[PDB]
């Protein structure tokens, strides 16, 4: 099934009547409007493009404005695509609400994880720090060795080194759908999802199941 | 660590290919005094956006 685009509102807890606290992430899933439908004849694959939210009229460029006007929908804050199974069918301008998840038990949530900046090997790859005492010289958090001797005489590709960490697309799979509140456009899922507060999330039905 | 071979003037120029300065794109003209100034900065005469902000 297709997914929806939402916004990470924050984290809450749900107290069940049997004394269990469920940590939930709240995703504000407002209506997603279909701005384009792609098919085999014209595009070679079946997918729907959707938008959500609102945008400044003076910050929507003319190409974007024309693309939205052809669909007949208000300009959203972005465009996302969802592949279609052979049974699913939508029409341009159709609106999809969080009611789509009314009978879904588990979802996959994809978002851009928090950015940690240039991170060291200890933080990025869980390398073990060397000794803090016992004569260690300026080598407390350094990587250590990065290869063998003359053979091969090089460093292998994919070597774990320090560098940019976070700020990348991350998918968390098989999160329970705690609650679907259609009137408040809310999806309460169990657990933590990637991204900071106010970030865009893509919620799909769980692919593993 | 130090070079095993002396780098060339070609390689030196290639490295310095990114060292070029960028001139200021354009100067703003004050609506009252007509003086040119950096955008969002006061003029040399103490004007900003047509108003005499600092005397002298």
């Amino acid at each position: 099934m297709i997914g929806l685009v939402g916004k990470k509102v924050g984290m809450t807890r749900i107290f069940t009547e049997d004394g269990v606290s469920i940590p939930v992430t709240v995703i504000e899933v407002e209506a997603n409007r279909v701005t384009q439908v792609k098919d085999l004849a014209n595009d070679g694959y079946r997918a729907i493009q959707v938008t959500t939210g609102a945008k400044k009229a003076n910050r929507v460029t003319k190409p974007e404005a024309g693309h939205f006007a052809k669909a007949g929908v208000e300009a959203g804050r972005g465009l996302w695509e969802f592949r279609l199974a052979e049974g699913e069918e939508f029409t341009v301008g159709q609106s999809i609400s969080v009611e789509l998840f009314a009978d879904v038990k588990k979802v996959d949530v994809t978002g851009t994880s928090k950015g940690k900046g240039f991170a060291g090997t200890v933080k990025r790859w869980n390398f073990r720090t060397q000794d803090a005492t016992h004569g260690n010289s300026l080598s407390h958090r350094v990587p250590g060795s990065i290869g063998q001797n003359q053979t091969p005489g090089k460093v292998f590709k994919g070597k774990k080194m320090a560098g940019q960490m976070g700020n990348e697309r991350v998918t968390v799979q098989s999160l329970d759908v705690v609650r679907v509140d259609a009137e408040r456009n809310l999806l309460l899922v169990k657990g933590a999802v990637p991204g900071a507060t106010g970030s865009d999330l893509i919620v799909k039905p769980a692919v593993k199941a | 660590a130090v070079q095993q071979n002396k780098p060339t003037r070609s390689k030196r120029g290639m490295r310095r290919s990114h060292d070029a300065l960028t001139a200021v794109t354009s100067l703003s003209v004050d609506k009252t005094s007509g003086e040119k100034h950096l955008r969002h900065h006061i003029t040399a005469d103490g004007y900003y956006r047509g108003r005499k902000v600092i005397a002298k």
């Binding site: 807890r13 107290f15 004394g19 269990v20 606290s21 | -």
Partner: protein, 123 residues
């Protein structure tokens, strides 16, 4: 949160006063043992006429920790000391006949029913 070299008090009357964890049983590279976990202990101090002697190696079940246990609603129960109950190497049944101090609900299993029954108070 008990690991190797951790000193624990004894919550029963087996005769031991201080024991030391020498292995957290139940998995390769396993680090910590919480309440309801079985550890291998050596006896560091014992009373003169006890059922166990200093230097013995046997098992024990951790019944109280300073780190504490966490309940499903987020609550946490903490104690002021780490205390365990001694157990045979083979049967893993309690050695003593009395249990001292409170224990937690985490022992509510068919394996530790004797401890649950003998405990003065279950939290």
């Amino acid at each position: 949160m008990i690991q190797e070299q951790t000193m624990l008090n004894v919550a029963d009357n087996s005769g031991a006063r201080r024991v030391m964890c020498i292995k957290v049983l139940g998995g390769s590279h396993r680090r910590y043992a919480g309440v309801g976990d079985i550890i291998k202990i050596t006896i560091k101090e014992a009373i003169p006429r006890g059922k166990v002697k200093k230097g013995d190696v046997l098992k024990a079940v951790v019944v109280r920790t300073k780190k504490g246990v966490r309940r499903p609603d987020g609550s946490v129960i903490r104690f002021d000391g780490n205390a365990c109950v001694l157990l045979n190497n083979n049967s893993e049944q309690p050695i003593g006949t009395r249990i001292f101090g409170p224990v937690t609900r985490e022992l509510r299993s068919e394996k530790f029913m004797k401890i649950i029954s003998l405990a003065p108070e279950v939290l």
